């Protein structure tokens, strides 16, 4: 595909800009549906039966998500009648606002599409456009941080790490593990929103970079654990060392800068007399680490995936941000712990 | 009344159907693209609807730059359609 693929990709970039730079309620409504028209062609790409099934499952869940969001916009005319994105002014519209944004994100009750959508994506270039897409509903949630009830956000954040922590244990597909770490990390996202809206934006920065480092290192084609197994000996051994720095960082480990969200999310919550919730956060986070525990053994060990066919010609992929971003993803906890102020 | 004008037309239309029945005693996916283009052009026409309706009061220097712009992209969409459209 020539220029038209870049134009479609630029309209997702432009689509989230309408969401970011906004004041009107129908303006963000357009911004969400600008993405809906633009992700689907990249979802298809290679003319697959899996791609047709994934896109239809992606659309029918996210089209209903937007129409539930528009109901919250119309109730904002029923009561008050002000079309400025600041507060919902309703105990009813706030319910239909948070649950609609939960549909677009990987939050607890509306998570079922996430693993099956990720499987149907043809290439690693399309796999980024779900992790980057989650910036759009998060940007609205930052704007309407008050007037939203704790009983139907924090319950959806706690359950998502529970179902995320058990949702990747019986899975071997590399796309499916990344799809359930998405559900796992979204619980750490929305838990901060009541206890200071700050650090939610920084949690995005850590997550989006760390997820993009994975798929750019998955440019050497691998879909399963057994296909990423034949990489230690048949392919380059230095590549297994750099993926190890990204696998272990996604779980809660302090020498790596993937502990930098788990630094402040617990810290800000403990300030507001809540200890029983951050305990439940950190223990369930070990189940998220446990996926990468068995996935590190694919790279650290021999595991016998030799294969008679040996590659002599050197691999030439895109690798656009595959060098600059993992250096920041591995070490930033010693570099910038004062970056909380710089981001938000 | 508008309802009095509507119902009288429909009731006499159904009355002719009563005369028509009671009184006697004895595949191809290419055509889908037409419907796609039609529906997408309707909304651009729907946005170009208030032209002889909003131009009476509003500023002309602000409108003319935007009014032509909708018809331009309505032709730019057709410019993309020209490069391999179909046999139909």
């Amino acid at each position: 595909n020539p220029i038209i693929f870049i134009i479609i990709l630029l309209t997702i970039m432009l689509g989230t800009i309408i969401v970011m730079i906004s004041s009107h309620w129908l303006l963000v409504w357009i911004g969400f549906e600008m993405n809906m028209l633009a992700i689907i062609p990249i979802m298809m790409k290679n003319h697959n039966p899996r791609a047709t099934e994934a896109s239809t499952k992606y659309f029918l869940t996210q089209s209903t998500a937007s129409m539930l969001l528009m109901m919250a916009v119309i109730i904002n005319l029923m009561f008050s009648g002000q079309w400025t994105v600041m507060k919902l002014f309703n105990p009813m519209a706030s319910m239909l606002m948070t649950m609609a944004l939960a549909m677009k994100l990987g939050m607890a009750p509306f998570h079922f599409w996430v693993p099956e959508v990720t499987q149907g994506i043809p290439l690693s270039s399309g796999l980024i456009l779900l992790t980057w897409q989650k910036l759009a509903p998060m940007s609205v949630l930052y704007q309407i941080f008050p007037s939203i009830n704790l009983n139907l956000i924090l319950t959806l954040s706690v359950l998502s790490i529970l179902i995320g922590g058990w949702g990747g244990l019986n899975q071997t597909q590399l796309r499916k593990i990344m799809a359930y770490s998405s559900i796992a990390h979204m619980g750490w996202m929305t838990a901060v929103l009541p206890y200071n809206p700050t650090m939610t934006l920084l949690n995005l920065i850590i997550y989006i970079i760390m997820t993009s480092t994975m798929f750019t290192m998955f440019m050497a084609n691998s879909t399963t654990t057994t296909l990423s197994l034949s990489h230690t000996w048949n392919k380059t051994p230095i590549m297994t060392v750099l993926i190890l720095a990204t696998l272990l960082s996604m779980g809660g480990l302090p020498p790596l800068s993937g502990f930098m969200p788990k630094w402040m999310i617990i810290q800000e919550m403990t300030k507001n007399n809540s200890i029983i919730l951050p305990t439940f956060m950190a223990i369930t986070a070990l189940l998220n680490l446990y996926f990468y525990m068995r996935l590190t053994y694919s790279t650290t060990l021999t595991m016998f995936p030799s294969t008679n066919n040996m590659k002599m010609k050197w691999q030439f992929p895109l690798m656009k941000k595959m060098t600059f971003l993992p250096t920041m993803v591995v070490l930033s906890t010693m570099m910038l712990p004062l970056t909380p102020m710089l981001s938000v | 009344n508008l309802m009095l004008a509507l119902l009288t037309n429909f009731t006499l239309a159904t009355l002719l159907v009563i005369i028509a029945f009671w009184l006697p005693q004895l595949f191809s996916m290419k055509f889908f693209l037409v419907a796609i283009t039609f529906l997408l052009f309707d909304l651009e026409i729907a946005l170009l609807l208030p032209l002889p309706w909003a131009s009476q009061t509003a500023n002309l220097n602000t409108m003319l730059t935007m009014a032509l712009f909708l018809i331009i992209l309505l032709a730019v969409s057709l410019a993309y359609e020209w490069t391999q459209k179909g046999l139909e």
């Binding site: - | 009476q56 009061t57 500023n59 002309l60 220097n61 003319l64 018809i71 032709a75």
Partner: protein, 80 residues
């Protein structure tokens, strides 16, 4: 001419309706900026009062008089 004389007469021979699609639509963009006649249309458009007039309380003010015919205010008299 390399394409001014070459790629014009070919367009007349091969689909001359496409000439009309660029020329008439082209004149629709260029001519409104060039013509010194668009200024008159804006004058009467603002002059036409759809809403009711409002009276302002004057305390030492110029260019304002009574509702009767007097040399005051705007009141456009462009070509009768």
């Amino acid at each position: 001419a390399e394409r001014v004389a070459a790629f014009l007469k070919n367009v007349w021979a091969k689909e001359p309706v496409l000439v009309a699609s660029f020329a008439i639509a082209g004149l629709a963009v260029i001519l409104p900026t060039l013509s010194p006649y668009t200024k008159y249309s804006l004058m009467i458009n603002x002059x036409x009062x759809x809403x009711x007039x409002x009276x302002x309380x004057x305390x030492x003010x110029x260019x304002x008089x009574x509702x009767x015919x007097x040399x005051x205010x705007x009141x456009x008299x462009x070509x009768x």
